[PDB]
Amino acid sequence: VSFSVPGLVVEDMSNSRWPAQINGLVVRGNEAQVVHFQNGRCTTEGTLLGTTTLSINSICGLRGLSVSQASVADTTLWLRVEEPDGRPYDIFGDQPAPLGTPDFTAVIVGTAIRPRTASGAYLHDAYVDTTPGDADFTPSTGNTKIVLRGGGSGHVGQGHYWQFRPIAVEGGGSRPQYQEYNLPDYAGPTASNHDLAPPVAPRMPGELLLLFESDMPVWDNGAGAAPAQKIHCLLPNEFITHLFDLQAPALAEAALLRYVHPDSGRTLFECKLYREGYMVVAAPAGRLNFPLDGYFRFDSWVSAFYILSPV
Amino acid sequence: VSFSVPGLVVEDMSNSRWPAQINGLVVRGNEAQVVHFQNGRCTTEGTLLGTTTLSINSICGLRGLSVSQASVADTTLWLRVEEPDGRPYDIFGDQPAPLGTPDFTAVIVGTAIRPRTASGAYLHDAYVDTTPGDADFTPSTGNTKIVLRGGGSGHVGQGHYWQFRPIAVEGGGSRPQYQEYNLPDYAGPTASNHDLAPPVAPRMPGELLLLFESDMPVWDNGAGAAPAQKIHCLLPNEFITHLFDLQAPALAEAALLRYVHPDSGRTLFECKLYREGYMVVAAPAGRLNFPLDGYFRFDSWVSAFYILSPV
Predict the structure, then answer these.
(1) Which residues of A176-200 are buried (b: 16+ CB within 10 A; e: fewer)?
(2) CA B64 to CA B89: how far, in whole Å?
(3) Which segments constitute the Calicivirus coat protein C-terminal domain (chains A, B) (predicted)?
(4) Of A43, A50, A47, A39, whose CA–CA distance to A17 is shortest?
(5) Preferred mutation among A10, A74, A85, A293 to probe B, highest tally of B CBs within 10 A
(6) A-chain residues within 8 Å CB-CB of B119?
């Protein structure tokens, strides 16, 4: 099975850690805070890592049956978290948390949805505090607290299917910081994470990480004064489903991709997609000024010592 | 280029008319209301139709710069609608509306997001009325009205980028009906649609349309008593990106697909994926009781006269 990557243009592809179209290519330096994403992790052989799900609508989300607080105006909803496909979460499996689980610290704003209930469907404005300041964010041990913002009492009784779908993160001076490179405490403050997908840090001199950027919407209680945010990922969802479906074995350490721009009728830059599932370019940190109506094309398997042409 | 379909399991794939995982396979008879979807339309040769976009996060949404009402407590947002990629919408092109535009009539509840503006990012609870009752739904002529529910004044000034992201449809006695098979008036109640993707109506006797189904969340002002809903599409997004990227010529009228279930170690049913971009089965109308951890496999090109084994 020969290796290949999708021929879809960048602006048509979606973020693997957040529901947003890709609207930028940026290069990240070798910062103190190491990339350690749990979502959007796939090898070139199509091995999903961490909490990576192929189910796009399940990304950075939580889902499962409502339970009582004992068994574990704002109203708290308590979920027994499960996998996107409806099957139970394996506490002692080799995932840090259920697939799709948020992989960063912030207060994630979204909607709590109760879509199948016989008495009637229900939804409500909600948020999930994923920071260590929330002792109840413990999806690694089977439960999470979701806060229905300004209502929901009488609607959170046990025994019902719920989804939390993300819309934004909180911003503003009084509110907890959004830190996309800071992993949450999946088992809460009192216990440790386990089975994390490995850190991502380019080993070769001159090669810096290429990240796919999206806009991150911000909630600030109707003010509209908090500063705009972004969120990044190693690979678009379409790369991930493609690699998964393909299962091509890696013939070298990295796959040389060229970024082709039909309107220019030529290659704009080249990059290496390492077996471990991340891209690098020979370029300094910062935003790449290239049109996003171009696509990646697999040209060759190369060694780790293949020297990239400067971007 | 040989034809193939994705080998991904159904429960991993996503609705091409709505942001939701697929969670059902249903069969639809030949009712008075003919399937006429504008989203989720792609041929087996990878040709996109209607308003079908590859940008998953753009589906059933609106986006573009804010304009003044003149140029065209609740606060009305007026958009100059554009394409998902940021390029202008071609009023006199061959789409009924910009790509991803909602293709049914309802009141679609969602979030109006102003995510990049320098003075500060903003968002608010919003809705878009796509029924003929809203004369201001005219994306065919370049403008749509989005209603910010219970606020937003002072934030809707001209010259800013906005997105409306769908969450649910309204339900409950006093509210306009959700009709997923009823096309909207793209040019408003006083003008005609143009360039619609063609109707979907199986020609062969005994063959009925197979649809991929998802849950449709319902907003009913926090009551939680409105009946639960569904939404359907002809092909999941993962099929659509696969067909687009592939561009494989059709060799007959239809591709015989087998639904393979690894756990059962056998084919569960078969179907015909017509070139026009829809699947049929030899089965009566209603829900298909099959596990959704199976996948489709292309086995052969067949004539329209190929007789399907009953499901």
Answers:
(1) bebebbbbbbbbbeeeeeebbbeeb
(2) 10
(3) 82-311
(4) A39
(5) A85
(6) 224-225
Nearest CA in chain B to A150: B222
- What's the half-sphere exposure (Cβ side, CA atoms, 13 Å) at A155? 28
Give the CA distances from residue B4 to residues B8, B242, B245, B248, B272, in Å, rounded to whole numbers and listed in that order.
12, 8, 11, 8, 13
Q: Please identify which residue in the block is written with the tokens 């049913």.
A: B269
Give the Å distances, CA to CA, from B111 to A57, A203, A255, B61, B254: 16, 42, 40, 10, 40
Cβ atoms of B68 and B158 closer than 8 Å: yes
| φ/ψ (deg, to 5) at B4 | -155, 165
Strands B122-129 vs B143-148: parallel, antiparallel or unpaired: antiparallel
Sorted by where each starts, the structural domains of chain B and their CATH numbers stand as 1-58+177-311 (2.40.510.10), 59-176 (2.40.30.120)
Name residue, tokens 């809903």.
B229
Measure CB to CB from residue A7 to each of B119, B125, B245 and give the nearest one: B245
The coordinates were experimentally obtained by: X-ray
Among B278, B297, B258, smallest CA distance to B28 is for B278
The nearest CA of chain A is from the CA of B280 a distance in Å of: 24
Residues of B in contact with A122 (CB under 8 A): 224
Residues B106 and B229: their CA atoms lie apart, in Å, by 12
Tokens of A69: 């607080």
Contact indicator for A250, B147 with CB cutoff of 8 Å: no
> Beta A278-281 vs A208-216: how paired, if at all?
antiparallel
Say yes or no for a CB contact (<8 Å) between A219 and B123.
yes
